[PDB]
């Protein structure tokens, strides 16, 4: 893996492919078992290959920016509820270049209202990709249970796509969660 | 784990707790990328502990039977659309001594129409447990991708509760859901 400057990434040869994924989240006041604060509702997706990842996809020649790519792809995966907002350049977090495929993976985090995020959750089964490219959404448990293993640490033992695990860890550190 | 016949499992006494789970599935003629047959939609659930399991829960004092407990629990976990069908004794598959102090886990498999199963998925975010006890539904991918790893093999590498993994595989074999 290799962190790359955005300007650097945009200037990569025409050969390279770009993908954009977004962490959609909202403040959540709720309490699991009336005891353990949820803190935030964060969405991930089980992909057709059995790995957990974030919603998004490939930027294509038809797209004029990373962001039009992302939002276009977001609407496929999540359905019309995703068109209630737009992930923009101001939501951008990172670009990562692995080895293997010539792909740069850009990460975005978009804060929403709990209402908005819930509506995205509730409509995702009517999205184009549901039951095909996408197997279903999950929430990320931000809490660690009393045994120190259940909740977030066990969630992180699941199989993840690409940099999604790294991308999530980083975004939680930046939210003051650990 | 140690399989018990249903009559013996039921004969366990007083301090033993009973938990009931259902594999809900439906035929699906969909083709991934126009070429990989889905065969069936099968539901599992990301639990509050980050583990994948099947929907259901604990039978309580007020339930008349295992089946009443299971259907009640499914209504709580999945929401209203779970009440379009009823999981019966005919759907029962197995009982095992679970991981947990004195717990027997009963397992059921229930075939639905696709319409019924889509409706369980569509309503699931409004259920009582959603966002709390449960974190979200996912379909079990039954195919293996060209690389020989993506799909079912990789899915089987996720974190599972109790013996959910083993209940899935057995059910996949006995119900003839793979090729
Ligand atoms: Na419950």
Author numbering:
A (entry chain B): 4 to 181
B (entry chain A): 4 to 182
Sentences from the paper on this structure:
A similar cleavage reaction was observed in vitro with other enzymes from diverse organisms, including a snake venom phosphodiesterase (SVP), mammalian ectonucleotide pyrophosphatase/phosphodiesterase 1 (ENPP1), Escherichia coli RppH (EcRppH), and Homo sapiens NudT16 (HsNudT16). In addition, although NudT16 was initially characterized as a nucleolar U8 snoRNA decapping enzyme, it is involved in mRNA decapping and expresses across mouse tissues. Given the versatility in the recognition of substrates with diphosphate bonds, we and others have used some of these Nudix enzymes in vitro for processing ADP-ribosylation to a unique mass tag for site identification by tandem mass spectrometry (MS/MS).
The crystal structures of mutants F36A and F61S show that the replacement of the phenyl side chain of these residues with a methyl or a hydroxymethyl group, respectively, opens up the mouth of the enzyme. The ~9 Å width of the cavity at the Phe36′ to Phe61 increases to 12.6 Å in the F36A mutant. Interestingly, mutation of residue F36A results in a displacement of retention volume from ~10.5 ml (HsNudT16, HsNudT16 H24W and HsNudT16 F61S), which correspond to a molecular weight of 40 kDa, to a retention volume of ~11.2 mL (HsNudT16 F36A and F36A F61S), which correspond to a molecular weight of 27 kDa. This change in retention volume suggests that the lack of phenylalanine at position 36 weakens the dimer, shifting the population to a monomer. Widening the mouth of HsNudT16 at the level of the non-adenosine ribose seems to be deleterious for ADPr hydrolysis activity since the F36A mutant is less active. Despite co-crystallization efforts with ADPr, electron density for the substrate could not be seen in the binding site of these mutants.
